[PDB]
Amino acid sequence: QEMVQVFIPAQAVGAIIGKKGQHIKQLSRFASASIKIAPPETPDSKVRMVIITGPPEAQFKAQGRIYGKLKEENFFGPKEEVKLETHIRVPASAAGRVIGKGGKTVNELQNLTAAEVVVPRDQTPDENDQVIVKIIGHFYASQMAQRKIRDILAQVKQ
């Protein structure tokens, strides 16, 4: 049961919601996921944040449909991969294991998946004592990086 934040080009909100919400309802139906779009913290925001809640199966479908819908609506193209920024919140206790001794873990993640993976250093944990990992990649890359991070996280629970 994960939660993920996906930043999409602001001009794509319409496409992602649909006429009278048709598409977003259609997209959660298809993914079985909570899919809320946050209002902008700021008037002229560049991106808008999609918040997606559900288990990995649902994350995969929902995220895939978002990347995919952006391709369709030609916000990227045509010989251009959709790259999106994605945040996941993680136990502030565990985030050091994600970087690894000498940043060798996060290094390998990027090598394996080709996603940029950043743990902004020294952040200030939220209410639930979590910090963010940033992931920028094409679809398959960001999912692979996610799965692996969640792997790492599971281990720390030992």
PDB file of C-alpha atoms in Angstrom:
ATOM      1  CA  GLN A   1       0.000   0.000   0.000  1.00  0.00           C
ATOM      2  CA  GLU A   2       2.295   2.784  -1.253  1.00  0.00           C
ATOM      3  CA  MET A   3       1.970   6.514  -1.904  1.00  0.00           C
ATOM      4  CA  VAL A   4       3.749   8.324  -4.691  1.00  0.00           C
ATOM      5  CA  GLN A   5       3.819  11.866  -6.002  1.00  0.00           C
ATOM      6  CA  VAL A   6       4.157  12.366  -9.764  1.00  0.00           C
ATOM      7  CA  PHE A   7       4.840  15.792 -11.183  1.00  0.00           C
ATOM      8  CA  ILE A   8       3.288  16.428 -14.547  1.00  0.00           C
ATOM      9  CA  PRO A   9       3.431  19.455 -16.838  1.00  0.00           C
ATOM     10  CA  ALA A  10       0.775  21.860 -15.614  1.00  0.00           C
ATOM     11  CA  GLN A  11      -0.832  22.127 -19.034  1.00  0.00           C
ATOM     12  CA  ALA A  12      -1.606  18.409 -18.951  1.00  0.00           C
ATOM     13  CA  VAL A  13      -3.961  18.500 -15.973  1.00  0.00           C
ATOM     14  CA  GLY A  14      -6.924  18.859 -18.289  1.00  0.00           C
ATOM     15  CA  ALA A  15      -5.905  15.821 -20.297  1.00  0.00           C
ATOM     16  CA  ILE A  16      -5.343  13.764 -17.190  1.00  0.00           C
ATOM     17  CA  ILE A  17      -8.690  14.645 -15.571  1.00  0.00           C
ATOM     18  CA  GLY A  18     -10.906  14.542 -18.651  1.00  0.00           C
ATOM     19  CA  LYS A  19     -14.194  16.185 -19.683  1.00  0.00           C
ATOM     20  CA  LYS A  20     -16.275  16.101 -16.491  1.00  0.00           C
ATOM     21  CA  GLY A  21     -13.569  14.018 -14.839  1.00  0.00           C
ATOM     22  CA  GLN A  22     -14.195  11.167 -17.266  1.00  0.00           C
ATOM     23  CA  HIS A  23     -10.518  10.232 -17.750  1.00  0.00           C
ATOM     24  CA  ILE A  24      -9.174  10.303 -14.212  1.00  0.00           C
ATOM     25  CA  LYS A  25     -12.136   8.240 -12.961  1.00  0.00           C
ATOM     26  CA  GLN A  26     -11.380   5.983 -15.929  1.00  0.00           C
ATOM     27  CA  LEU A  27      -7.767   5.802 -14.946  1.00  0.00           C
ATOM     28  CA  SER A  28      -8.345   4.844 -11.304  1.00  0.00           C
ATOM     29  CA  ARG A  29     -10.975   2.374 -12.435  1.00  0.00           C
ATOM     30  CA  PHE A  30      -8.314   0.838 -14.633  1.00  0.00           C
ATOM     31  CA  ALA A  31      -5.622   0.951 -11.945  1.00  0.00           C
ATOM     32  CA  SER A  32      -7.673   0.529  -8.782  1.00  0.00           C
ATOM     33  CA  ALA A  33      -5.886   3.477  -7.151  1.00  0.00           C
ATOM     34  CA  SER A  34      -6.648   6.700  -5.310  1.00  0.00           C
ATOM     35  CA  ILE A  35      -5.625   9.361  -7.746  1.00  0.00           C
ATOM     36  CA  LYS A  36      -5.986  12.905  -6.474  1.00  0.00           C
ATOM     37  CA  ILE A  37      -4.553  15.962  -8.184  1.00  0.00           C
ATOM     38  CA  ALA A  38      -3.308  18.553  -5.684  1.00  0.00           C
ATOM     39  CA  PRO A  39      -4.049  22.277  -6.173  1.00  0.00           C
ATOM     40  CA  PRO A  40      -0.907  24.352  -6.848  1.00  0.00           C
ATOM     41  CA  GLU A  41       0.967  25.757  -3.832  1.00  0.00           C
ATOM     42  CA  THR A  42       1.716  28.680  -6.143  1.00  0.00           C
ATOM     43  CA  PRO A  43      -0.215  30.626  -8.791  1.00  0.00           C
ATOM     44  CA  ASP A  44       1.922  30.083 -11.874  1.00  0.00           C
ATOM     45  CA  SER A  45       3.301  26.579 -11.115  1.00  0.00           C
ATOM     46  CA  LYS A  46       5.266  24.767 -13.842  1.00  0.00           C
ATOM     47  CA  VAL A  47       4.161  21.299 -12.807  1.00  0.00           C
ATOM     48  CA  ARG A  48       1.178  19.945 -10.918  1.00  0.00           C
ATOM     49  CA  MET A  49       1.453  17.073  -8.483  1.00  0.00           C
ATOM     50  CA  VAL A  50      -0.497  13.870  -8.988  1.00  0.00           C
ATOM     51  CA  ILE A  51      -0.833  11.826  -5.811  1.00  0.00           C
ATOM     52  CA  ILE A  52      -1.272   8.106  -6.299  1.00  0.00           C
ATOM     53  CA  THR A  53      -2.122   5.672  -3.539  1.00  0.00           C
ATOM     54  CA  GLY A  54      -2.242   1.926  -3.752  1.00  0.00           C
ATOM     55  CA  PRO A  55      -0.182  -1.258  -3.788  1.00  0.00           C
ATOM     56  CA  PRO A  56       2.591  -1.836  -6.398  1.00  0.00           C
ATOM     57  CA  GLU A  57       0.254  -3.421  -8.974  1.00  0.00           C
ATOM     58  CA  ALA A  58      -1.871  -0.260  -8.847  1.00  0.00           C
ATOM     59  CA  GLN A  59       1.112   2.033  -8.830  1.00  0.00           C
ATOM     60  CA  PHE A  60       2.412   0.384 -11.974  1.00  0.00           C
ATOM     61  CA  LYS A  61      -0.867   0.679 -13.893  1.00  0.00           C
ATOM     62  CA  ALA A  62      -1.664   4.211 -12.762  1.00  0.00           C
ATOM     63  CA  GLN A  63       1.829   5.543 -13.353  1.00  0.00           C
ATOM     64  CA  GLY A  64       1.986   3.815 -16.736  1.00  0.00           C
ATOM     65  CA  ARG A  65      -1.255   5.386 -17.801  1.00  0.00           C
ATOM     66  CA  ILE A  66       0.021   8.819 -16.780  1.00  0.00           C
ATOM     67  CA  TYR A  67       3.310   8.561 -18.658  1.00  0.00           C
ATOM     68  CA  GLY A  68       1.314   7.110 -21.535  1.00  0.00           C
ATOM     69  CA  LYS A  69      -1.410   9.686 -21.681  1.00  0.00           C
ATOM     70  CA  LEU A  70       1.319  12.359 -21.845  1.00  0.00           C
ATOM     71  CA  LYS A  71       2.811  10.616 -24.880  1.00  0.00           C
ATOM     72  CA  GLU A  72      -0.588  10.400 -26.561  1.00  0.00           C
ATOM     73  CA  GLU A  73      -1.450  14.066 -25.972  1.00  0.00           C
ATOM     74  CA  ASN A  74       1.893  14.949 -27.552  1.00  0.00           C
ATOM     75  CA  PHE A  75       3.344  16.881 -24.647  1.00  0.00           C
ATOM     76  CA  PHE A  76       6.479  15.053 -25.540  1.00  0.00           C
ATOM     77  CA  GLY A  77       7.322  13.857 -28.970  1.00  0.00           C
ATOM     78  CA  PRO A  78       7.609  12.443 -31.142  1.00  0.00           C
ATOM     79  CA  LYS A  79      10.878  10.517 -30.765  1.00  0.00           C
ATOM     80  CA  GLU A  80      11.061  11.639 -27.180  1.00  0.00           C
ATOM     81  CA  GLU A  81      10.700   9.657 -23.996  1.00  0.00           C
ATOM     82  CA  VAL A  82       8.391  10.997 -21.339  1.00  0.00           C
ATOM     83  CA  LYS A  83      10.596  11.662 -18.301  1.00  0.00           C
ATOM     84  CA  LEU A  84       8.798  12.616 -15.108  1.00  0.00           C
ATOM     85  CA  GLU A  85       9.812  13.533 -11.593  1.00  0.00           C
ATOM     86  CA  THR A  86       8.428  11.358  -8.860  1.00  0.00           C
ATOM     87  CA  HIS A  87       8.724  11.661  -5.055  1.00  0.00           C
ATOM     88  CA  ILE A  88       8.352   8.899  -2.531  1.00  0.00           C
ATOM     89  CA  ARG A  89       8.497   9.581   1.217  1.00  0.00           C
ATOM     90  CA  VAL A  90      10.667   7.201   3.216  1.00  0.00           C
ATOM     91  CA  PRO A  91      11.484   6.559   6.899  1.00  0.00           C
ATOM     92  CA  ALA A  92      14.109   9.131   7.849  1.00  0.00           C
ATOM     93  CA  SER A  93      15.800   6.264   9.649  1.00  0.00           C
ATOM     94  CA  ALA A  94      16.043   4.221   6.427  1.00  0.00           C
ATOM     95  CA  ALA A  95      17.134   6.931   3.979  1.00  0.00           C
ATOM     96  CA  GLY A  96      20.796   6.397   4.854  1.00  0.00           C
ATOM     97  CA  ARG A  97      20.533   2.797   3.723  1.00  0.00           C
ATOM     98  CA  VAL A  98      19.196   4.051   0.395  1.00  0.00           C
ATOM     99  CA  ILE A  99      22.262   6.216  -0.102  1.00  0.00           C
ATOM    100  CA  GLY A 100      24.478   3.478   1.262  1.00  0.00           C
ATOM    101  CA  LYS A 101      27.955   3.779   2.771  1.00  0.00           C
ATOM    102  CA  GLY A 102      29.851   6.114   0.423  1.00  0.00           C
ATOM    103  CA  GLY A 103      26.746   6.700  -1.675  1.00  0.00           C
ATOM    104  CA  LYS A 104      27.523   3.404  -3.312  1.00  0.00           C
ATOM    105  CA  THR A 105      23.981   2.085  -3.028  1.00  0.00           C
ATOM    106  CA  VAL A 106      22.193   4.984  -4.695  1.00  0.00           C
ATOM    107  CA  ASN A 107      25.044   4.929  -7.203  1.00  0.00           C
ATOM    108  CA  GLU A 108      24.239   1.395  -8.189  1.00  0.00           C
ATOM    109  CA  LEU A 109      20.523   2.093  -8.352  1.00  0.00           C
ATOM    110  CA  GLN A 110      21.154   4.707 -10.995  1.00  0.00           C
ATOM    111  CA  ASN A 111      23.546   2.417 -12.849  1.00  0.00           C
ATOM    112  CA  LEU A 112      21.049  -0.473 -12.896  1.00  0.00           C
ATOM    113  CA  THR A 113      17.864   1.434 -13.689  1.00  0.00           C
ATOM    114  CA  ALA A 114      19.142   4.543 -15.550  1.00  0.00           C
ATOM    115  CA  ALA A 115      16.854   6.687 -13.366  1.00  0.00           C
ATOM    116  CA  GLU A 116      18.339   9.727 -11.640  1.00  0.00           C
ATOM    117  CA  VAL A 117      17.970   9.042  -7.941  1.00  0.00           C
ATOM    118  CA  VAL A 118      18.580  11.743  -5.402  1.00  0.00           C
ATOM    119  CA  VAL A 119      18.212  11.838  -1.695  1.00  0.00           C
ATOM    120  CA  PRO A 120      18.406  15.560  -0.948  1.00  0.00           C
ATOM    121  CA  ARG A 121      20.908  15.650   1.882  1.00  0.00           C
ATOM    122  CA  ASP A 122      19.945  16.786   5.396  1.00  0.00           C
ATOM    123  CA  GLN A 123      16.241  17.432   4.885  1.00  0.00           C
ATOM    124  CA  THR A 124      13.775  18.015   7.665  1.00  0.00           C
ATOM    125  CA  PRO A 125      11.498  14.961   8.194  1.00  0.00           C
ATOM    126  CA  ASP A 126       7.742  15.540   7.957  1.00  0.00           C
ATOM    127  CA  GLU A 127       5.107  14.697  10.571  1.00  0.00           C
ATOM    128  CA  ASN A 128       5.620  10.954   9.995  1.00  0.00           C
ATOM    129  CA  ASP A 129       9.388  11.273  10.248  1.00  0.00           C
ATOM    130  CA  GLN A 130       9.910  10.753   6.520  1.00  0.00           C
ATOM    131  CA  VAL A 131      12.131  12.389   3.951  1.00  0.00           C
ATOM    132  CA  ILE A 132      11.796  12.217   0.169  1.00  0.00           C
ATOM    133  CA  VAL A 133      13.648  10.370  -2.487  1.00  0.00           C
ATOM    134  CA  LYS A 134      13.467  12.059  -5.893  1.00  0.00           C
ATOM    135  CA  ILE A 135      13.300   9.894  -9.023  1.00  0.00           C
ATOM    136  CA  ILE A 136      13.560  11.259 -12.568  1.00  0.00           C
ATOM    137  CA  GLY A 137      13.350   8.765 -15.402  1.00  0.00           C
ATOM    138  CA  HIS A 138      11.344   7.327 -18.225  1.00  0.00           C
ATOM    139  CA  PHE A 139       8.536   5.013 -17.095  1.00  0.00           C
ATOM    140  CA  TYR A 140      10.238   1.652 -16.879  1.00  0.00           C
ATOM    141  CA  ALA A 141      13.327   3.177 -15.200  1.00  0.00           C
ATOM    142  CA  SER A 142      11.421   4.993 -12.462  1.00  0.00           C
ATOM    143  CA  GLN A 143       9.377   1.854 -11.663  1.00  0.00           C
ATOM    144  CA  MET A 144      12.473  -0.284 -11.465  1.00  0.00           C
ATOM    145  CA  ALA A 145      14.059   2.284  -9.102  1.00  0.00           C
ATOM    146  CA  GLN A 146      10.908   2.338  -7.004  1.00  0.00           C
ATOM    147  CA  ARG A 147      10.667  -1.458  -6.583  1.00  0.00           C
ATOM    148  CA  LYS A 148      14.333  -1.588  -5.612  1.00  0.00           C
ATOM    149  CA  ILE A 149      14.079   1.239  -3.076  1.00  0.00           C
ATOM    150  CA  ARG A 150      11.075  -0.468  -1.506  1.00  0.00           C
ATOM    151  CA  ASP A 151      13.316  -3.558  -1.392  1.00  0.00           C
ATOM    152  CA  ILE A 152      16.001  -1.730   0.529  1.00  0.00           C
ATOM    153  CA  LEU A 153      13.304  -0.347   2.832  1.00  0.00           C
ATOM    154  CA  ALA A 154      11.956  -3.807   3.644  1.00  0.00           C
ATOM    155  CA  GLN A 155      15.446  -4.917   4.693  1.00  0.00           C
ATOM    156  CA  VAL A 156      15.984  -2.028   7.141  1.00  0.00           C
ATOM    157  CA  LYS A 157      12.914  -3.332   8.970  1.00  0.00           C
ATOM    158  CA  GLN A 158      15.220  -6.079  10.260  1.00  0.00           C
TER     159      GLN A 158
END
